[PDB]
Enzyme design. Structure first.
Site, PDB file in Angstrom:
ATOM      1  NE  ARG A   1       0.828  -1.039   0.991  1.00 57.65           N
ATOM      2  CZ  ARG A   1      -0.215  -0.692   1.736  1.00 57.65           C
ATOM      3  NH1 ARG A   1      -0.695   0.533   1.700  1.00 57.65           N
ATOM      4  NH2 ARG A   1      -0.790  -1.607   2.527  1.00 57.65           N
ATOM      5  CB  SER A   2       8.189   3.399  -0.616  1.00 60.38           C
ATOM      6  OG  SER A   2       7.217   4.195   0.045  1.00 60.38           O
TER       7      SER A   2
ATOM      8  CD  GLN B   1       7.649  -3.773   4.445  1.00 61.18           C
ATOM      9  OE1 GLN B   1       6.652  -3.215   3.948  1.00 61.18           O
ATOM     10  NE2 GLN B   1       7.881  -3.788   5.752  1.00 61.18           N
TER      11      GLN B   1
ATOM     12  CB  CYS C   1       4.208   2.905   2.109  1.00 55.60           C
ATOM     13  SG  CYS C   1       5.835   2.172   2.180  1.00 55.60           S
ATOM     14  CB  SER C   2       3.238   2.251   7.098  1.00 57.11           C
ATOM     15  OG  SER C   2       3.079   2.667   8.477  1.00 57.11           O
ATOM     16  CB  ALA C   3       8.131   0.775   6.969  1.00 51.73           C
ATOM     17  N   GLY C   4       8.107   3.120   4.524  1.00 54.55           N
ATOM     18  CA  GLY C   4       8.925   3.639   3.433  1.00 54.55           C
ATOM     19  C   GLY C   4       9.871   2.630   2.797  1.00 54.55           C
TER      20      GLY C   4
ATOM     21  CG  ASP D   1      -6.686  -2.972   5.097  1.00 51.67           C
ATOM     22  OD1 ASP D   1      -7.495  -3.012   6.064  1.00 51.67           O
ATOM     23  OD2 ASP D   1      -6.300  -1.876   4.627  1.00 51.67           O
TER      24      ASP D   1
END
EC number: 3.1.3.48
Length: 284
Positions: free
Chosen positions: A221-222, A262, A215-218, A181
């Site tokens: 992690r992406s 990020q 991922c969430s925003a791309g 998380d």
């Protein structure tokens, strides 16, 4: 400069934040006018994350062709990726329309549906064989065929049917389920193992359309996923593997989508993953 030595240099001097800020300063800025049109406000998860106009994926429909997704085309490595946000309730049908139109074989998911007590993307695939999903706005049917749950990831076989033509295709869903998380993993071993499983499936290979990764925003992690893959492939291909410069590769990729990687912790983890993964590419 061998990245492994660059790595120890940055680590001992504790300058990861300063390195990362240089990247942010030098990164490309291109227009994203389509993403910002008022008719598209409910198609974007975050106001500050948008596809550039020159590299955005277009849906094949005359109505509204917009989706928050970008084509990252790596010319020396000969790899392409589509990076996108986690789908929203109003965009699950657009997402599968894109998978169909771009002829992708695999979808790579690097987040859980719920993290930190909040929803990070819609439940966009079926969870039981006998309970299929129909996307009426884009005329597609999605069925769960099989599921293989492992300790660090799950791989699912899905059937996507174009209800207009009754053609069907097999899509592979690669779901990394153990990113924490907060922060990044302590060891890159399980992330590298996941990357090699995606590779072995054929989903990254030129006989198929580009893999869709999110991922969430791309972007975070992406971004780590595609940066590590491209860097390891370049080390395979070149006469001098120590010539691969991860910061230069990251800046090339940011010509195609803003904000990739990020945090300074994600940058450091990307180094660690490439360094450890090379101890197979050079031959292990």
């Amino acid at each position: 400069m061998e990245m492994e030595k660059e790595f120890e240099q940055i680590d001992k001097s504790g300058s990861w934040a300063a390195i990362y800020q240089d990247i942010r300063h030098e990164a490309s800025d291109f227009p994203s006018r389509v993403a910002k049109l008022p008719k598209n406000k409910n198609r974007n998860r975050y106001r500050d994350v948008s596809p550039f106009d020159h590299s955005r994926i277009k849906l094949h429909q005359e109505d509204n062709d917009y989706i928050n997704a970008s084509l990252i085309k790596m010319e020396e490595a000969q790899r392409s990726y589509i990076l996108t946000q986690g789908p929203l309730p109003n965009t699950v049908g657009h997402f599968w329309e894109m998978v169909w139109e771009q002829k992708s074989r695999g979808v790579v998911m690097l987040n859980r549906v719920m993290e930190k007590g909040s929803l990070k993307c819609a439940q966009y695939w079926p969870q039981k064989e006998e309970k299929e999903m129909i996307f009426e706005d884009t005329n597609l049917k999605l069925t769960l065929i099989s599921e293989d749950i492992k300790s660090y990831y799950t791989v699912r076989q899905l059937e996507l049917e174009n209800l207009t033509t009754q053609e069907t295709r097999e899509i592979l869903h690669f779901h990394y389920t153990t990113w924490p998380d907060f922060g990044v993993p302590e060891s890159p071993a399980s992330f590298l193992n996941f990357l090699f499983k995606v590779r072995e499936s054929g989903s990254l290979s030129p006989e198929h359309g580009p893999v869709v990764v999110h991922c969430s925003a791309g972007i975070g992690r992406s971004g780590t996923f595609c940066l590590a893959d491209t860097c390891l492939l370049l080390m395979d291909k070149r006469k001098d593997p120590s010539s691969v410069d991860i910061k230069k590769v990251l800046l090339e990729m940011r010509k195609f989508r803003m904000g990739l990687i990020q945090t300074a912790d994600q940058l450091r983890f990307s180094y660690l993953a490439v360094i450890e993964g090379a101890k197979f590419i050079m031959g292990d």
